């Protein structure tokens, strides 16, 4: 199914603007996704344009706020680069205030024939994803002078992540006890907490940004866990569960930023734990208690940095060197 586009471009800004695109395999034209909000947006964009395989023109993520990943373009494997934006650009993205994942490059293959790339002012997008796109996309071969903002891609996105490791998994029929190894970054007061995510998951393909892909809603139940005393292994007991049910679990660390814009962090992999048995349903919906605000996160982070600065001032004042 080829879907030609009138006037070349096709701005998408809602669910409805995509519903002229259902079942399309190859889009002849360019796309400028500009999504600033919506409702249950992830599964809807997957249903409307998940089947897009090839785009003849270029692609653009100008100022799109709501989307978290471009993972809803599931079969998107080729951008022909026929129609280009100014600058000879086949992929273009800017001012994407929540774009955290570009694509899962372990499972996905993209070919970009001609035209450079452009990543200016993506706050929560890491440069590792960008360089993976440079290599997998087909720009290292056919060397193109790509223009990526080195200093404004990855702002408040931890990209130097280590690996947490689980230690202890005790299942039950309605509860699961987890304890992973203790983590401390090079200053231990930076670690504010861990973020246990979990999700009932009947298949072992659940990546991190599967599900949510949207501001306003989420697919993962989230638990926020204070660190222990600095040794103690931390963990959590998941409580309101169902018997004989497979879960997907990981734990991610949230740290403060040093006075250089340097980040740290660790993030455990996805592990699947099934409980024990006893005597539109893809997810739950998850607003028995709706999750934590990003501005509330920045307030908590500043509370942390304030406690750390006062302690630094006290240790600076009290200890006096030998003359």
């Amino acid at each position: 199914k080829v879907c030609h586009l009138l006037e070349g471009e096709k701005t998408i800004d809602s669910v409805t603007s995509a519903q002229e695109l259902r079942g399309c395999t190859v889009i002849n034209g360019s796309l400028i996704i500009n999504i600033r909000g919506g409702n249950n947006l992830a599964a809807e964009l997957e249903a409307n344009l998940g089947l897009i395989e090839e785009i003849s023109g270029y692609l653009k993520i100008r100022r799109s706020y709501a989307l978290v990943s471009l993972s809803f373009f599931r079969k998107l494997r080729l951008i022909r680069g026929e129609t280009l934006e100014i600058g000879n650009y086949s992929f273009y993205a800017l001012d994407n205030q929540n774009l955290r994942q570009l694509w899962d490059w372990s499972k996905h293959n993209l070919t970009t024939t001609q035209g450079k790339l452009f990543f200016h002012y993506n706050p929560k997008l890491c440069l590792s994803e960008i360089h993976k796109m440079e290599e997998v996309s087909g720009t290292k071969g056919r060397q193109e002078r790509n223009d990526i903002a080195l200093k404004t891609n990855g702002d408040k996105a931890s990209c130097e992540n280590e690996l947490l490791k689980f230690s202890y998994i005790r299942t039950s029929f309605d509860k699961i006890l987890l304890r992973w190894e203790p983590y401390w970054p090079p200053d231990f007061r930076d670690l504010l907490g861990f973020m246990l995510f979990y999700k009932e998951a009947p298949y072992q393909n659940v990546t991190e940004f599967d599900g949510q892909d949207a501001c306003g809603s989420n697919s993962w139940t989230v638990v926020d866990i204070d660190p222990p005393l600095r040794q103690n292994h931390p963990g959590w007991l998941m409580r309101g569960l169902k018997p004989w049910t497979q879960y997907a679990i990981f734990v991610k660390t949230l740290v403060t930023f040093s006075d250089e814009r340097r980040t740290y962090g660790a993030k455990s992999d996805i592990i699947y734990v099934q409980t024990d048995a006893t005597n539109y349903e893809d997810s739950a919906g998850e607003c028995c208690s709706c999750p934590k605000t990003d501005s509330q996160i920045l307030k908590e982070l500043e509370e942390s940095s304030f406690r750390k600065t006062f302690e630094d001032y006290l240790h600076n004042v009290v200890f006096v060197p030998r003359p």
């Binding site: 200053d187 630094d312 240790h315 600076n316 200890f319 006096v320 060197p321 030998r322």
Partner: peptide
């Protein structure tokens, strides 16, 4: 400036004995 030394860099044990009279 003990936080400027032992927390940001790594202090040697003699350089950290400086603060102990």
């Amino acid at each position: 400036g003990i936080v400027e030394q032992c927390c940001t860099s790594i202090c040697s044990l003699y350089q950290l004995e400086n603060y102990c009279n």
